[PDB]
Amino acid sequence: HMVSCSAPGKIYLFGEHAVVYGETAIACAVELRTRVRAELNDSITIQSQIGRTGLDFEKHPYVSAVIEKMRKSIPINGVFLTVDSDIPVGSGLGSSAAVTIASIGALNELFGFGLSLQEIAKLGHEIEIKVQGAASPTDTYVSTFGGVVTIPERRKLKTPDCGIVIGDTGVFSSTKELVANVRQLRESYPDLIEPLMTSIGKISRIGEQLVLSGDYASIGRLMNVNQGLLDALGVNILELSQLIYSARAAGAFGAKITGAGGGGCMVALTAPEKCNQVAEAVAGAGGKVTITKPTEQGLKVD
Amino acid sequence: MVSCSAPGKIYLFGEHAVVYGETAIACAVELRTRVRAELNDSITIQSQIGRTGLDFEKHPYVSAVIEKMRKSIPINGVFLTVDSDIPVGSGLGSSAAVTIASIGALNELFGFGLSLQEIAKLGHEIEIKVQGAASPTDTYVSTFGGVVTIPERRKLKTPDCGIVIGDTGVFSSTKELVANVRQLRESYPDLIEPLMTSIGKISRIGEQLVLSGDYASIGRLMNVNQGLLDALGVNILELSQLIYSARAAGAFGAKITGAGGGGCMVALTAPEKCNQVAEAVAGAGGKVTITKPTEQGLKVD
Ligand SMILES: C[C@@](O)(CCO)CC(=O)[O-]
Numbered sequence A: 001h002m003v004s005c006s007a008p009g010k011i012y013l014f015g016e017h018a019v020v021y022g023e024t025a026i027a028c029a030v031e032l033r034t035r036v037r038a039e040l041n042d043s044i045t046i047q048s049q050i051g052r053t054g055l056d057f058e059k060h061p062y063v064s065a066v067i068e069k070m071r072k073s074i075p076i077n078g079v080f081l082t083v084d085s086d087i088p089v090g091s092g093l094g095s096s097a098a099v100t101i102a103s104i105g106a107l108n109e110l111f112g113f114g115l116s117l118q119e120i121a122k123l124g125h126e127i128e129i130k131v132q133g134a135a136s137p138t139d140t141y142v143s144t145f146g147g148v149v150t151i152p153e154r155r156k157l158k159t160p161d162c163g164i165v166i167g168d169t170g171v172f173s174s175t176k177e178l179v180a181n182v183r184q185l186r187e188s189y190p191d192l193i194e195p196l197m198t199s200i201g202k203i204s205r206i207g208e209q210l211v212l213s214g215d216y217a218s219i220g221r222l223m224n225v226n227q228g229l230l231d232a233l234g235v236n237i238l239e240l241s242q243l244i245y246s247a248r249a250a251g252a253f254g255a256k257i258t259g260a261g262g263g264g265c266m267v268a269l270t271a272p273e274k275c276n277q278v279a280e281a282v283a284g285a286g287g288k289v290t291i292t293k294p295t296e297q298g299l300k301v302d
Numbered sequence B: 001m002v003s004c005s006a007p008g009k010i011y012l013f014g015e016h017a018v019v020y021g022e023t024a025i026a027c028a029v030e031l032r033t034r035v036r037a038e039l040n041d042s043i044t045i046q047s048q049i050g051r052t053g054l055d056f057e058k059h060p061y062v063s064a065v066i067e068k069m070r071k072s073i074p075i076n077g078v079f080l081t082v083d084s085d086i087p088v089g090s091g092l093g094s095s096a097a098v099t100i101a102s103i104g105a106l107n108e109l110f111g112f113g114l115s116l117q118e119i120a121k122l123g124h125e126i127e128i129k130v131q132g133a134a135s136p137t138d139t140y141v142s143t144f145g146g147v148v149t150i151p152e153r154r155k156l157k158t159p160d161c162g163i164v165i166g167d168t169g170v171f172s173s174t175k176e177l178v179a180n181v182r183q184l185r186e187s188y189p190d191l192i193e194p195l196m197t198s199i200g201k202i203s204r205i206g207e208q209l210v211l212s213g214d215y216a217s218i219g220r221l222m223n224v225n226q227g228l229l230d231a232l233g234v235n236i237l238e239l240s241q242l243i244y245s246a247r248a249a250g251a252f253g254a255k256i257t258g259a260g261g262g263g264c265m266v267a268l269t270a271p272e273k274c275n276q277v278a279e280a281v282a283g284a285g286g287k288v289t290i291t292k293p294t295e296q297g298l299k300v301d
């Protein structure tokens, strides 16, 4: 009676920060996944990298919210959930959405809730609102369904036959403060910054055709433009620049911040034959590197 | 023994976008080219590069300055000595300065009687002669000085700030960089042309911030301008390291000055944070020049 589910993380090819101002973005699930194993138990126990708890909204807020929410439809007396992940809690890789979706998947399987993927993505959205007070459905949608998806129209795009090199600066990045900083900048210089958001949106809409045609060189070129605009919005840091420039010099098609910035990770779109060379340059410049690829697979019952 | 000097300049905002009709703001800095002009036997010019006569290869600007000027007042012997504090490249203005200082030093030793605008026009056309083509910007800013808007040429109040210039020592072809931006603009005109508009809008806003002395906001707009230059593809790792080191050490702002691809960045700092910023830039590997803005254009020393 041992069930396991996994859900992937994601990167932004284009358009982070500008979505909340009405602009288009392109997200891409990657083959770094969070796994949740679930078992019948006498009590509620959650174990992850930060230890073992019961219901605990300081250490395990997403998993605990999932259990509380789902126990209202089919009562859950006890359960043992074990979480392990390749997604570092730290950047714009979607670690919160992955454990949320994987937790819902595991309990759906274990207790026979019979939820559809669409229902799961919607429930995962509700959980993140519960935990964060407000949240966009994007993270939990991409983790449920995988692949490449535009935001907010949710067009599904051809998954690139590409390497993806993620470089983690190890700097803790607080998404809400960076989002608030960008808002203050926009407020300070509205006629200047709002067109900058339009440009980021334009990049995503150009990028769509390039994703569909598989022009990874052109995609990387536009990723580099996008990186500049993100730098202009104030969310780049020295460590991110160094990883990004080191990836480019090693032959990446393009490299940029993914997610909120201010720390966290960058992403380098790389031909497969150049993944190691790119990864080595990024590690050499001080980055904790992960080599991965896009995935079409969202929530999976392992 | 006559002595004259003219300064270099940095861009506060607007490089790369002037050629697409947008506004820039330049700032003359207290880095100058001093030429001493005196009478001797033969036309002789001494610089760091060495001692020659009329030589349009080794001393192209000084020699072209002598060539044009003797046509209206004969010079048969000069002893022109040239020293400069101005680093080369990065649009810092070393050629414009050596030009203006020479014109004004020969005009002081000999006759001529030029006006300041007269000085600017001859310097600009001397650059035309030597480089083939040339913008009047560098020669005007070197002559009049202070803070100058481009192209409207309005003067603005000199900010009371430190100016840290960090040289990456990386060489870059300005013609090749300008062409790469032009190509990118042609590839994605609907995307890149609005970025050039944004650079101009920064200059329009920054003009008001210079007038009010809001150095903090000037720096913030410098940091936005730098992201746009990075988006246009003219940034590199060494420029970024210097720029972020200056910001973390308290600069109001830091950005590329000039064409990019290498060359120099500039940091605007409070006067009391200037050596702190300079030390951080040097520790990031930059070749640092510490300076400040200058009201003074061409000055008879
Ligand atoms: C920075 C942001 O745009 C994405 C962070 O991954 C925040 C958001 O869109 O909700």
Ligand SMILES: C[C@@](O)(CCO)CC(=O)[O-]
Residues within 6 Å of the ligand: B014, B015, B016, B017, B018, B019, B090, B091, B135, B174, B178, B258, B259
């Ligand atoms: C890129 C550019 O605007 C700055 C070089 O000084 C080119 C020019 O002004 O001639």
Ligand SMILES: [K+]
Residues within 6 Å of the ligand: A059, A060, A061, A062, A063, A064, A099
């Ligand atoms: K959790």
Ligand SMILES: [K+]
Residues within 6 Å of the ligand: B086, B087, B088, B089, B090, B091, B092, B093, B094, B095
């Ligand atoms: K120069």
